UniProtKB/Swiss-Prot annotation, chain A:
Full protein segment contained here: 99 to 537 of 545
CC annotations in GO: core mediator complex; mediator complex
Biased composition (Polar residues): 51-64
Designated name of the protein: Mediator of RNA polymerase II transcription subunit 17
Gene Ontology annotations of biological process type: positive regulation of transcription initiation by RNA polymerase II; regulation of transcription by RNA polymerase II; transcription initiation at RNA polymerase II promoter
Region of interest called Disordered, as start-end residue ranges on this chain: 50-70
Protein localization: Nucleus
Role of this protein: Component of the Mediator complex, a coactivator involved in the regulated transcription of nearly all RNA polymerase II-dependent genes. Mediator functions as a bridge to convey information from gene-specific regulatory proteins to the basal RNA polymerase II transcription machinery. Mediator is recruited to promoters by direct interactions with regulatory proteins and serves as a scaffold for the assembly of a functional preinitiation complex with RNA polymerase II and the general transcription factors.
Molecular function in Gene Ontology: transcription coactivator activity; transcription coregulator activity
Keywords of the record: Activator, Nucleus, Transcription, Transcription regulation
Annotated source species: Schizosaccharomyces pombe (strain 972 / ATCC 24843)
Curated annotation (Swiss-Prot), chain D:
Compartmental location: Nucleus
Subcellular location, principal: nucleus
Upper taxonomic lineage: Eukaryota, Fungi, Dikarya, Ascomycota, Taphrinomycotina
A Pfam match: Med8
InterPro entries: Mediatior_Med8_fun/met (IPR019364)
Name listed for the protein in its UniProt record: Mediator of RNA polymerase II transcription subunit 8
Quaternary structure annotation from Swiss-Prot or TrEMBL: Component of the Mediator complex.
MF annotations from Gene Ontology: RNA polymerase II cis-regulatory region sequence-specific DNA binding; transcription coactivator activity; transcription coregulator activity
Record's function text: Component of the Mediator complex, a coactivator involved in the regulated transcription of nearly all RNA polymerase II-dependent genes. Mediator functions as a bridge to convey information from gene-specific regulatory proteins to the basal RNA polymerase II transcription machinery. Mediator is recruited to promoters by direct interactions with regulatory proteins and serves as a scaffold for the assembly of a functional preinitiation complex with RNA polymerase II and the general transcription factors.
Family classification: Belongs to the Mediator complex subunit 8 family.
From Swiss-Prot, chain E:
Keyword Transcription appears in the UniProt entry: yes
UniProt keyword annotation of Nucleus present: yes
Coarse class of the protein's main subcellular location: nucleus
Job description of the protein: Component of the Mediator complex, a coactivator involved in the regulated transcription of nearly all RNA polymerase II-dependent genes. Mediator functions as a bridge to convey information from gene-specific regulatory proteins to the basal RNA polymerase II transcription machinery. Mediator is recruited to promoters by direct interactions with regulatory proteins and serves as a scaffold for the assembly of a functional preinitiation complex with RNA polymerase II and the general transcription factors.
Entire-sequence positions represented here: 10 to 158 of 216
UniProt record similarity statement: Belongs to the Mediator complex subunit 6 family.
Protein name: Mediator of RNA polymerase II transcription subunit 6
GO molecular function: transcription coactivator activity
Subunit structure, as described in the record: Component of the Mediator complex.
Swiss-Prot record, chain F:
Name assigned to this protein: Mediator of RNA polymerase II transcription subunit 11
Family: Belongs to the Mediator complex subunit 11 family.
Free-text function comment from the UniProt entry: Component of the Mediator complex, a coactivator involved in the regulated transcription of nearly all RNA polymerase II-dependent genes. Mediator functions as a bridge to convey information from gene-specific regulatory proteins to the basal RNA polymerase II transcription machinery. Mediator is recruited to promoters by direct interactions with regulatory proteins and serves as a scaffold for the assembly of a functional pre-initiation complex (PIC) with RNA polymerase II and the general transcription factors.
Originating species: Schizosaccharomyces pombe (strain 972 / ATCC 24843) (Fission yeast)
Protein origin, superkingdom: Eukaryota
InterPro entries in the record: Mediator_Med11 (IPR019404)
The protein's assembly and partners: Component of the Mediator complex, which is composed of at least 21 subunits that form three structurally distinct submodules. The Mediator head module, the middle module, and the tail module. The head and the middle modules interact directly with RNA polymerase II, whereas the elongated tail module interacts with gene-specific regulatory proteins. Med11 is part of the head module. Forms a heterodimer with med22. The med11/22 heterodimer binds to and stabilizes the central head subunit med17.
Amino acid sequence: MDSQAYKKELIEQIMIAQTECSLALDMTSLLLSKFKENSIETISPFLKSTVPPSSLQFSRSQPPESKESDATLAKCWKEKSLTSSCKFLFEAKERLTSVVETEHEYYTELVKVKEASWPLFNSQGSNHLSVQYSCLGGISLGLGLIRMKPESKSFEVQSSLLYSQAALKISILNKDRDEIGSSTWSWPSQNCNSVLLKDIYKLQEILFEMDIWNSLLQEAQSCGNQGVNFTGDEILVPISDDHVVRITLETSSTNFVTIKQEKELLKCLCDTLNAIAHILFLKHCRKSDRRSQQDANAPLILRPLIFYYNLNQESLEFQRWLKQRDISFKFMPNYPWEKAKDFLELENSLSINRLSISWRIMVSNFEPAIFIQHTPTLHGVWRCKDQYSSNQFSSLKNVCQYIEHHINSL
Amino acid sequence: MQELYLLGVVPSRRFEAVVNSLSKTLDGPKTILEFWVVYRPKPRQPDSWLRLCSNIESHDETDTEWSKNTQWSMYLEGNSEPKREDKCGIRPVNRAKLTNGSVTEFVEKMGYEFSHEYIIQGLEYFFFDTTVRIYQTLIPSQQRSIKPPFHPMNEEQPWILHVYTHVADASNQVAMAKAEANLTKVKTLLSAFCDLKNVRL
Amino acid sequence: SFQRQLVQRTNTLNSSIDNATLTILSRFQDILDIAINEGKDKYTVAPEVYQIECHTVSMVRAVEQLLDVSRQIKSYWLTNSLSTSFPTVDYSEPDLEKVKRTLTKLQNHLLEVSLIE
Amino acid sequence: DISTEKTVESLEAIRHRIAQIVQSLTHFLAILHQSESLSPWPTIHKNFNILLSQIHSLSNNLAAHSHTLQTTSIYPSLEFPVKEQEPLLTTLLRTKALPEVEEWEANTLQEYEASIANDAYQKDQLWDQARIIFMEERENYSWFRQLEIDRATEEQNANQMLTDILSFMKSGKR
Amino acid sequence: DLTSIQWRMPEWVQSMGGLRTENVLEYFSQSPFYSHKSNNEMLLNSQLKRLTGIQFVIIHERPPFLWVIQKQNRLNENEVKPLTVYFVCNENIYMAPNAYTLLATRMLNATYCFQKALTKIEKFPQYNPQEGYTYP
Amino acid sequence: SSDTQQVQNILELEAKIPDILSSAGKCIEAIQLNNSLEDFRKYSKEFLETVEFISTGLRRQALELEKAEVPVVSLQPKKRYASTPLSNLIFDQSSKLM
């Protein structure tokens, strides 16, 4: 039975009914025209043109005969309609009882979402409830509608989100561009008694990882001077010894063996990288709440990380130089995070500002110390105080030959 | 500078309800506490009056000397445009911040005599780069004293609601129109749970 | 205004409840008035048959109307603002000193420390 | 003579109810034709109840002049174009029921003898006492905001209170 | 049944040289509407006044195609009770319909459609409080 | 008293709403099938009771909505870029990785 084909049946009967009523109207309007002029105005146009007014007459007469079965029809019809009335009312109760049942389950599950203090809204025209699953945080804050699952007869939250699973994967790459080690972000498991709540967490977790990915993706465009490439699927940060750091959004023992030791190290690297990346994005989110109370360029998160790396690298290159030519040196860095009271402090601590590195290099035991204060900047740094003067140097290249000058004659 | 505003009122019992609803709709809140002192020159013009303001929300209450210490601002709050309905009240305010040796000693040299003082207390919410403030004006224990408790204006004082948006240039066309264009979006947002009409200041 | 809004929502809700509760009672009575048959002509009973059915249908729709109203009321009780946000299982609380050590350990990887000078 | 006026007046009352029902029938059809997808169930039901009230008036009107009508015979007047068109005359005067209505009677009569007066009055006298029971019992229950006035008086005193505090913040009137 | 029957005899008409007010009642005599009990059998419209009982008379005449015939009961030479009306239209005889049984029937036909129309459609829509009325 | 509590009470009203249709048909069944006018008394009293219980029950709610001063319009949600339970959520797992 097609909905559109059900309409035709209705029109049919109502039209059979009309032509019947109208036919009765036609007969009586003709009969009345004999005694009133205005009465002929309810006869069909066709009848009006073809049949003259006062063409129907009537006489006093007839019994008419009384019918036997007709009085049994009247009794039957009434009795049949009154029992059908009971059946129908009892049918409509039985269906609507089970209808209130399935509605009861849906609302008991909805109370669980309100109990948890999750924001619930109705779209003006939708006439259906929706949760703000992206409640706690992130760039974009989307909602998901709650519905009864038609198949399993259970509940779920539908979303615009294109993925089931979504998590940031930061990995390291070979000279041959093989995965030397990786880290995919996980989440602390939250105990859920409600299947409806399980969904809400999974969705926030999905959206938040999408948010961090696109902010990372935006940053990649902003920093090309670090040789950073991107396909919108991967972010590749080229690092030392032809190695690469590939950042991507992932969607749908012995302890003494030198290779096993290295592998564990690279796991710690990727894990902390992911961990700092998330903390830094969190900080950027907190920054936006401050801004919303009164966005330019991109979030900082990817570049300070690059910066802190190149620091280890350049200071290590220096350590190599000073080792190659036996030179006693004391390397004293004061990392911002080292003195932090809590995590909200450590969050602000992960930043290029308030970072200095103090070096005391000894040309000879019988020569004065060369004090080097290293303070690099994100954009575009070496202060060397010796027995004679304080000198600032453009590059480590220059610093290294300035020391060379001080030692040589030995 | 020009200040475009809308005024409404929230009762003493409905404060926790309107603030909980205001919290859940717009970005915020932020704690606002100010010590205001007004000075009048030696009919009378209300626009010729000078209004000082000191943000003491993060300041110590037992602190003795704070008039030369806590930051002060000079406000020249004029009168709003006459015959205004279905639209927002508009009044120009001339702002000037100061940092000097003595603030309380200078103000009397000009010829301005002490008239009155009021303390602004409440929360400030932000959405669409236009501000909405739910405050209450209280009377202190001693004159020019941050010593609590603070006495309200009446036994059961209500909460004055002030929705302010700024446009620094009167000559500006789109900037002056956008503050009014966004106050429609503000008015419609708070109108569902609060009351806001046009009041003359 | 907000108070007029509160009044109007109560008014429209009441009216839809009233018309539904009336129809249930009114149409049920209508059936009882028509239920009488003895003395009636088959031509006069045939439309009563329709009436009696037409009425029972109206009664069901009036009960279904009450279910549309109770659904609104429930959605109005889930649209009111809650006082606080939801808690989380922050259990497995963060160890700051674990983090600090790993952070410097990596930052000083292969580098000789100052002897804390 | 005197009685012809009574039939005429009764037919004018009948002609009117038939006209009103034809109008609701045309209107029902009109509503159905617009959506071209079975119209909203409440409107289909809404228009059925309109018919209900229209047929209920007509059955009551026909039975009101039951004897008056039963005692009258319609036939063509000397003015009818009987030559050219007697089949439409025969149609206007068709006394026969719809085949589907005939079959209805036939089947409801079959089922009656398939299952197989004094108690007919007895059941009716019960339905009448039932209606009297209901209408009595309906009056033992009550069907269908001074707190709104308490909440309103709160607004007006606070508005006048607000009008006084704006003067204190500008001039200083206590 | 005679209420909805159409009787015609073109043979008699042809053999009598058409129908006129003079032979129209003799034509009606061959029809199953005519009762041989009637005062017409033993017996003109002047002689029927003197008699009592069932008598058939022409109440309206419009030749050569329309004649209205009335069966009646004569009480006296003044009072007469009309019984059933008939009409001869194009040599075909019909029994003038009863005002009630023709109107009541049309209204009975019209009401049948309504029940048939409602009963069918009342089953199709499904009600869900959240979804409202949907057509499956 | 709480918003979730008032819904739990509506679910109660709702359970008894389809029963209006049963007790109505039951009345008709009393005279039509059983011919007992005293069953009709019982069930009509029952029908009217359930009808009144639900009617007043719902009007009690429409008023308690106005009493709780529940807003009419579904309001535009606020955009929290960061929250107190999200921060420590990140903080927990980030320490778990170090």
